[PDB]
Amino acid sequence: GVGHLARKGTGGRSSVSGIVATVFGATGFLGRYLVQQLAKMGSQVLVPFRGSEDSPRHLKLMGDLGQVVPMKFDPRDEDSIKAVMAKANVVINLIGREYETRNFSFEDANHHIAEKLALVAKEHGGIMRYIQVSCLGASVSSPSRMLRAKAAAEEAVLNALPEATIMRPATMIGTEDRILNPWSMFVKKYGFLPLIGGGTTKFQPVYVVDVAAAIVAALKDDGSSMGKTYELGGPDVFTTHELAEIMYDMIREWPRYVKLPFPIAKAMAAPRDFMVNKVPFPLPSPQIFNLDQINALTTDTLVSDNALKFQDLDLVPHKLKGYPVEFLIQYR
């Protein structure tokens, strides 16, 4: 699958790599880093967005001039997706949602959109590399509804395009993550950090920059990545307790844990589940008490011992104890 890169510079901002990528859902957490690392090599990035035109505003700084071109699109409409995908030798999918909106359910936002993006790339032959980003715990048997949709999108993408790599990272940590920041916000607002499982479940936090660099390396491979499913995980197997301890270490506050068994937190997150319908379609999104996340935090999520990892791409993840979590000094 060689032919998707042609270096025409010094590998700087004004250099020219022969990559023209369309990054769907780049206005979120991972997109802000993936687009930045794509633009640094001189790759033109098309950023399709929906809604307000201020959402992709921060991505214009990453390219030199015209390297980043935001374009409006509608997931429901199909000709818009084809229009925003025409000039693209690479397509990267980052579209996904962890809570449920009445406009877009768990299956719609995680599976159907991925199906449409894979199909449109199929008819529009010419995308040399296609990347779809699921979640590490993606499995059909997973109690969480989001993970099952991501898994189904995995088989859908692999069936619609056997050359599509599926990078499958774990919980991300960064300046704008949705795990460490809500914890600090809750601590500064209520004084205690609730534990939906008593700080027992084990998971593998990964730095978002490491995941973006992994996607970049998968793009700039020797052709081994094609039709593979990497499992991007951090170096240390933390837990909900030890990560909260690091967060208290950074935020500089005396620890105060309120243990909460799974049933009580499940019933406390239940009200939003059956109140998605109301006079307004929008409703305040969950912060730490997402029912889907609580169900996902019942089975330990670790990188498979017999699956591809960071070291199979010649990358070493950052140790999530110093620089990765230095953003927490803003609450200090």
Partner 1 sequence: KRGEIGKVSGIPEEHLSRKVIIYSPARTATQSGSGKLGKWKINFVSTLKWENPLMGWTSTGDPYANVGDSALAFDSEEAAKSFAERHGWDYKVKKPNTPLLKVKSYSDNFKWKGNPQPE
Partner 2 sequence: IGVPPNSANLTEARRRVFDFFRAACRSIPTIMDIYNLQDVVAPSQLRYAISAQIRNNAHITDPKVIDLLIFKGMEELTDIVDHAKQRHHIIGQYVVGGKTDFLKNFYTSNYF
Partner 3 sequence: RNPVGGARVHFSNPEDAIEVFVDGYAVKVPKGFTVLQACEVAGVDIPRFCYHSRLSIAGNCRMCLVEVEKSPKPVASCAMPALPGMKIKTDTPIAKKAREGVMEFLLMNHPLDCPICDQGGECDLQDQSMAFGSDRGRFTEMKRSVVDKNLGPLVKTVMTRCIQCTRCVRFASEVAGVQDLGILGRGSGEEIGTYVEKLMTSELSGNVIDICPVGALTSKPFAFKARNWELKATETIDVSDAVGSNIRVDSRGPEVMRIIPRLNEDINEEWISDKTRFCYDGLKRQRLSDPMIRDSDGRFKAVSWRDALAVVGDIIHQVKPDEIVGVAGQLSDAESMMVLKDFVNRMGSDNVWCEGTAAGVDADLRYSYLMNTSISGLENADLFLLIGTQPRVEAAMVNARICKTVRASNAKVGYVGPPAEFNYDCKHLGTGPDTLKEIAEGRHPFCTALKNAKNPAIIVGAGLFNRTDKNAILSSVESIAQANNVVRPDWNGLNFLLQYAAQAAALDLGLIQQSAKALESAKFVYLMGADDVNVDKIPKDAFVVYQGHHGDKAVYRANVILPASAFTEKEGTYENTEGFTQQTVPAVPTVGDARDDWKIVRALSEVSGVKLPYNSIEGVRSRIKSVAPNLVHTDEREPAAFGPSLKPECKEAMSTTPFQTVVENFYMTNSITRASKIMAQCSAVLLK
Ligand X SMILES: NC(=O)C1=CN([C@@H]2O[C@H](COP(=O)(O)OP(=O)(O)OC[C@H]3O[C@@H](n4cnc5c(N)ncnc54)[C@H](OP(=O)(O)O)[C@@H]3O)[C@@H](O)[C@H]2O)C=CC1
- Can residue 87 be called a binding residue for partner 1 (CB under 8 A)? no
Of 284 and 322, nearer to partner 2 (C-beta) is 322
Looking at residue 31, the DSSP 8-state letter turns out to be: H
Binding mask 33-62 for ligand X (x = CB under 6 A): -----------------xx---x-------
Q: Which of 1, 7, 126, 281 binds partner 2 (CB under 8 A)?
A: 7
Based on the shown chain and the rule CB under 8 A, indicate whether residue 10 belongs to the binding site for partner 1. Answer: yes
Amino acid at 102: R
Among 17, 19, 23, 27, binds ligand X (CB under 6 A): 27
Helix axes 113-123, 145-160, angle to 10 degrees: 10
Indicate the residue whose CB is closest to ligand X.
Answer: 28
In DSSP notation, 271-293 reads HHHTTS-SSSS--PPPSS--HHH
Q: Are β-strands 238-239 and 202-203 bridged in parallel, bridged antiparallel, or unpaired? A: antiparallel
Contact by Cβ (8 Å): 153, 117: no
The verdict on 329 binding partner 2 (CB under 8 A) reads yes
Residues in contact with 156: Cβ distance below 8 Å, sequence separation at least 6, in sequence order: 111, 114, 115, 118
Size of the site for partner 1 (CB under 8 A): 11
Q: How near is the Cβ of 29 to ligand X at its closest, in Å?
A: 3
Choice between 7 and 256, CB closer to partner 2: 7
User: Which residues inside 107-166 make contact with ligand X, applying CB under 6 A?
Assistant: 109, 113, 133, 135
Where would I find the H helices in the chain? 31-40, 79-83, 106-107, 113-123, 145-160, 180-190, 208-219, 240-251, 262-273, 291-296
The site for partner 2 (CB under 8 A) is made up of: 7, 322, 329
Contact residues for partner 1 (CB under 8 A)? Answer: 8-10, 12, 14-16, 44, 64-66
